[PDB]
Design a binder for this molecule. Sequence first.
Ligand SMILES: O=C(NC(=O)c1cccc2ccccc12)N[C@@H]1O[C@H](CO)[C@@H](O)[C@H](O)[C@H]1O
Ligand SMILES: O=C(NC(=O)c1cccc2ccccc12)N[C@@H]1O[C@H](CO)[C@@H](O)[C@H](O)[C@H]1O
Ligand SMILES: O=c1[nH]cnc2c1ncn2[C@@H]1O[C@H](COP(=O)(O)O)[C@@H](O)[C@H]1O
Ligand SMILES: O=c1[nH]cnc2c1ncn2[C@@H]1O[C@H](COP(=O)(O)O)[C@@H](O)[C@H]1O
Ligand SMILES: *Cc1c(COP(=O)(O)O)cnc(C)c1O
Ligand SMILES: *Cc1c(COP(=O)(O)O)cnc(C)c1O
Lengths: 807, 807
Amino acid sequence: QISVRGLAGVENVTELKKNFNRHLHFTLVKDRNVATPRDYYFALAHTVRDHLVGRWIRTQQHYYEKDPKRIYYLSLEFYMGRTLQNTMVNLALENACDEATYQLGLDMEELEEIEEDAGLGNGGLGRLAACFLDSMATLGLAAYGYGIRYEFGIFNQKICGGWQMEEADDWLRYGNPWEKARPEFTLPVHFYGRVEHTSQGAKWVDTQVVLAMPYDTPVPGYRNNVVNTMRLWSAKAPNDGYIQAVLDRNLAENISRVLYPNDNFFEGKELRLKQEYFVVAATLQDIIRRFKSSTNFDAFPDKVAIQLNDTHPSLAIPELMRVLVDLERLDWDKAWEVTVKTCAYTNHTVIPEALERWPVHLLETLLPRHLQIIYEINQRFLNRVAAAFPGDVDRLRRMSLVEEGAVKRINMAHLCIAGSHAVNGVARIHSEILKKTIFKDFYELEPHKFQNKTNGITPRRWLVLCNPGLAEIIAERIGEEYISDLDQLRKLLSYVDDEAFIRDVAKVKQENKLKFAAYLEREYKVHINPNSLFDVQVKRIHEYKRQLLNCLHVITLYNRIKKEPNKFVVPRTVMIGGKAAPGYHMAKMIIKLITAIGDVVNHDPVVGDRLRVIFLENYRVSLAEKVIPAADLSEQISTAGTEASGTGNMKFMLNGALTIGTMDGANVEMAEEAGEENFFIFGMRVEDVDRLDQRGYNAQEYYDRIPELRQIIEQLSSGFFSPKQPDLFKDIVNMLMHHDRFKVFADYEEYVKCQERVSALYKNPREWTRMVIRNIATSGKFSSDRTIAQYAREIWGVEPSRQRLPA
Amino acid sequence: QISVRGLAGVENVTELKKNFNRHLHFTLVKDRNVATPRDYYFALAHTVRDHLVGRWIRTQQHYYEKDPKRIYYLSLEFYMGRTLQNTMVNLALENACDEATYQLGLDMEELEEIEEDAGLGNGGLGRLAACFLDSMATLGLAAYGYGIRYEFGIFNQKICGGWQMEEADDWLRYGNPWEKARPEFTLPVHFYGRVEHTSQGAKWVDTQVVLAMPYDTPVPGYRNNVVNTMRLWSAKAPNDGYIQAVLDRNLAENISRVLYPNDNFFEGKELRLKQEYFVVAATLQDIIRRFKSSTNFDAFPDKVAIQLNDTHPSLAIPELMRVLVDLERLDWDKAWEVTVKTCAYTNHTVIPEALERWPVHLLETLLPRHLQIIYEINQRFLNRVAAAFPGDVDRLRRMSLVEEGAVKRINMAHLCIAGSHAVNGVARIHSEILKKTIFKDFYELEPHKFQNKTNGITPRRWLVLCNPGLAEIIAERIGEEYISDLDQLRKLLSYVDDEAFIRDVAKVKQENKLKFAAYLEREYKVHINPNSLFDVQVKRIHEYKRQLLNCLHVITLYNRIKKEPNKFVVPRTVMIGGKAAPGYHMAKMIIKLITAIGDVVNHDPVVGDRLRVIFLENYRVSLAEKVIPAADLSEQISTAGTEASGTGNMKFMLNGALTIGTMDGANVEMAEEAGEENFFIFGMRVEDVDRLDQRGYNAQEYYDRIPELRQIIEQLSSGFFSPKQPDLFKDIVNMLMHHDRFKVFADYEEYVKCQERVSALYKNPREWTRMVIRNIATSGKFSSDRTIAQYAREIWGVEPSRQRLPA
Ligand SMILES: O=C(NC(=O)c1cccc2ccccc12)N[C@@H]1O[C@H](CO)[C@@H](O)[C@H](O)[C@H]1O
Ligand SMILES: O=C(NC(=O)c1cccc2ccccc12)N[C@@H]1O[C@H](CO)[C@@H](O)[C@H](O)[C@H]1O
Ligand SMILES: O=c1[nH]cnc2c1ncn2[C@@H]1O[C@H](COP(=O)(O)O)[C@@H](O)[C@H]1O
Ligand SMILES: O=c1[nH]cnc2c1ncn2[C@@H]1O[C@H](COP(=O)(O)O)[C@@H](O)[C@H]1O
Ligand SMILES: *Cc1c(COP(=O)(O)O)cnc(C)c1O
Ligand SMILES: *Cc1c(COP(=O)(O)O)cnc(C)c1O
């Protein structure tokens, strides 16, 4: 049906049909008489998987032969989503499989919905790693993703009486056809023990052993026949009352059991530290083995790059030192040179409570050799600081890897800067803030280390896969080459005055909204007006992301309607979705508020279908692929200086939504690319937030001066949105009035006024769509292909290539 | 090469080769350049598995269509061993796969050794279930094996300094190609809670739910295209700090973690009770579902038979009652009629410490509704006893299901007799003892219930598979039909004076001994003389099995050699192997003694290669398949009245070894079949043991009267076999002298004299082999095909059939 979905050749369709029937019979052991939709999904998945295998084997064989520099991307999170459609897209199999399944009397779309998300991440950081894997494969890099195979990913979110409930994400229950267990490549990982000093160096002895078993998942590039590997480690007990000893094996295997869902506050939990070391120790053994098959470690940095996604895998730095010094017998200075040239570190937030600061007593017990190595790193680093800034004693305490106090801690961010040749932020404004504030001292010592790499998203998943209608109307005009060269979307500016294209763009959006409106009716008991403005804020629930500011506007619109019922207002469907960390009380209260607002607003007869507030349950990659194509307005309203980049913002821009946002993270670069006139910018800049911090933020001032704001707070306090429990939202009110770190009130007025300008433009469909075209056309910078090309050239020292392997 | 191994057709060989290469590439994701022997094993296993699938689907479809009476064999143990060779044998694929692999440059024998045993049983009871599955499939019965998929089977046994060490049997590490997970058929199982009495009957509420996930394994019949199912349940937690709750899922999943290895003493452990109910509750839901697809429960016993392997699944009786009464709303009397007609119970030991007697307080907490049902069963049963034997108050307390005392217990054996239409022992002498002693009262009340079903072994695994050389020389003379009709071996009596056959029989044995002698050298550091008499006792270590009596003879032979070094004695290799239950101190001491004897005997220069004592490490099904074909003498020396049947005894008889044994278990019937002159019978009969118990067993008497016995005990006491720890064996000596339940000394003299007659005959190779032929020729009764045919006709009410399905 759709040209970008590839050719449906008669031989290809015939072959897929027979291999589908083969797997149903031999692989699933099912007859057609009792087969269910799930069985049919698995037969299709196995059929598509077969097409990956030949390419996977020859790609990996090709790397062994040519011995290029290898890129190791270390992350505790890979937020992969579903794999079936992505695989079909990247192999040019989508139309063929669609035909083959139709001929067997099946709907492929229905089968696609059966696949569980691989939800092995929390949000943006996890999803960035996933987009990065796709781009590295598309750009022909010899890249490996390394992480943990969590048995349970991010929890499934149920909403019960307006409250978030958490449910185990048993994503492996029915099996994972995409992975291949490699028990033959199991490696030992050591914990605890003690350090022994011999005449012939230090020795780590009396350790407990946990085994790391790898599972490999293929990562196909876009139509280039490159298939890279994501290797995820699973924890296993070694084989050596009897019953109790066997049952206690669970203690070791708990390491890979569950993804930590806390994305707001650093908790120094021992199990988390074990997870971090587990991935690091197993991965580094693999890296070294693969390098030794190419032993002089001078060439190590020429053959290996290690990228640390946040400080989570920071133990890579002292682990590499441990192996080089203790096991390979290299002298300290040489090992350090190798380590620094090999490692690079990416930061994802300036928020202080997010920094990993591990208690010394924990490292002492768990990793005694690593603590000794960290101390030595610190001493040598501080000697260099002292020589560069003589007599500056305050600098020495500020830059130390060891933090003093009631409990001594290791600052893992400081460790990462010292042990890496490159440190990057994830958007221009973020990287600047790093140099000006949190890492200022480090920048003054080693300016050359600090870089920017503005984030991106893969246009395969985030356009072609989730929005085929838009991909097609674009391809009709400019061809298919933009899919792997997103800059070509600029050519669409020549169609901004084209009446046919304007109509098509608006048509694709309407079709997307109808489809999502129906989806909401089918799987939930909610009806929405598809003619209304789809106002969408989807992301993890955090105070800094200011879902609360959105909530205030919603109540403002409601109150205005109650004030002047017979006045025309642009109809809106306000959709807010996202998970809250299980221990984050305030975020759980915000979810409750959103549903409570909905309960009042959605049932007021005076409102009608002019305003609807829906909380989107269980927001995850697969839901993002559904809602983002349907959005008219993208809410990106974090307090200036708090959202390092954002990536959701980029997804909306590529999919035909306009953006209301602060000048924060990548929003700044987005507005720069599209033009400020084509963006709905509001609120304080970073500098304005700084000035307000100087004199001190007083929320009472805004409450006193803005009558519409006052009414809302009084409504919250009196129990208007909670009649049975009048004081339910007292915590929220208290926070807003007395200790709001994120200055919700300070941006309220400008936010509301900006929202009026949005409504004004939506009344003129032609001008809305023309602005939309201007956004889509300039979204090319935000391809992760661009991002990865910059990492490759400026950090890893490798050249990307669009050249196809023979298959 | 071998005719019984089937045809190697050119098309079949070509097809197997290409499917082997297909699986290596697509299934294992390996190139030939890095493939290991293990990879090659898996590719072969998947290729052979494909040939099962079509037959498996159509067999199960055939049962759905024809709706025959279904046989459900419930066991907590299925001691399956390896599956690859058995599958090839039963599908007539062995020669074809041998050719196909040879042409690819591989040795199939080497690949076969890579497969892990499925060691989901302890010994005889577990192995009986496995032989029974094979025979039921071969006889065309609609039979299902139901059990638990233990993550860890029977422990691997390491011998360290002469002591047994236990190691986890991680048999699933590399995956199990034979099983198919069926997560779609997961069923709930309830624990704890309380009983609520409503107007509309009893209700079991507030329970904890554990999920039962089935895994199906195919069971191929011998060349009849029948493939039955073994369904094994795996425990899973339902999906509903956050981290802790996820980690605590292990508590539920512990139910299927490990096989209980205690085969000597009943321990009322809660986890064991949970295992027993788990298998029962999940299985019964399956049985009922399948029956409802054929709701009047009058026909239930006409469509369902449930066989209880020991009392381990005895909870089937009150569970069936629970479902019929509480859920289906049948009146008590009707439900009871159905239950009794459906269930049958097999007993495996008369030893009192083996009886399952569950504390009432445990059942009260865990299964409160079942305890109520058990009480009601007991009351109604005791009312019947009272009516049949009025005024016999002693009978009432003896027959009660409830046992009185400091702690109240439920006798599960009494429950099984009350709730079953048939109760059987496993050999004629055993079944008689049941009627005369332990179940006398029950036999007087319901004589019709009590039956004998003499055990058997499958001649597929225990002749064709493990001893192809013997299978071939037999087939040359009488054809191939004996393999599924073992009675035909009687035709071999006409060859007892045939010089060619005598030579062939002796040749096959010599070749088997050379092969096993080499195996011992290759995988261990032990050399043996292949010309010596191979004297073998392999079985679990128990006091009743009297490995200690064997030990006394070995020391006797050693002492005689030291006394008269220059006198000729028939050279012997004495092999003893078997695992001891981890908590069984005495059995662990016996293993230590055996190795300690070896340390002295094997290193005495005066002895030479005339006597060797070897402990066979890690005895298990795969090792049994190697050692049994190599044996000359089979030691079956339990105290008369203690070994219910034995099955190892039958394996040796079929494989060309002569038997030294007591008149115990199936030994009696074996000697009856072969002729007493062709058996080495010694020792007390049951009646003699009884008489000795009357006057009281005094071991001191034998010590005083037998100088050779006295010398041995003094050697043990003084530290002759343990110079560093002189008192190491004081526990053994103390037991032998003062509290030996099994009367080791009483049989010593007759045992030693009998062993001299064995040595005498071995000096005459021609007459040895003629006696061997007389044994093999009369071993037909001991086929499990015969056993299963008797169960089918006399208990289950179904007719067996050798008729082949179309494939
Ligand atoms: O998702 C992020 N962090 C986590 O999920 C996270 C994961 C684990 C622990 C955390 C502790 C504190 C704060 C966050 C986490 N960070 C996001 O990274 C994206 C990719 O660079 C950025 O676009 C986004 O601004 C940032 O918040
Ligand atoms: O193996 C047996 N029992 C167990 O493994 C066993 C399994 C579990 C618990 C036990 C408790 C006490 C005694 C034995 C067990 N019994 C054997 O059953 C065979 C098959 O009928 C007989 O040939 C043999 O005589 C009997 O000992
Ligand atoms: O020793 C070797 N000889 C030939 N090829 C090898 C060897 N080692 C690795 N390879 C190839 O490199 C691929 C990936 O190796 P890995 O990166 O070490 O897992 C393998 O699948 C082989 O195709
Ligand atoms: O509802 C049905 N319609 C047609 N065949 C069925 C149906 N239910 C079961 N079967 C057949 O019976 C086989 C085994 O069913 P089970 O014994 O219930 O697992 C299935 O594989 C099918 O071939
Ligand atoms: C893109 C994405 C995110 C990141 O969104 P931000 O608005 O940048 O925080 C979080 N979760 C999912 C499922 C995503 O796809
Ligand atoms: C046959 C068998 C047994 C039973 O042997 P008995 O001598 O009858 O106790 C025990 N273990 C294995 C592995 C067997 O094959």
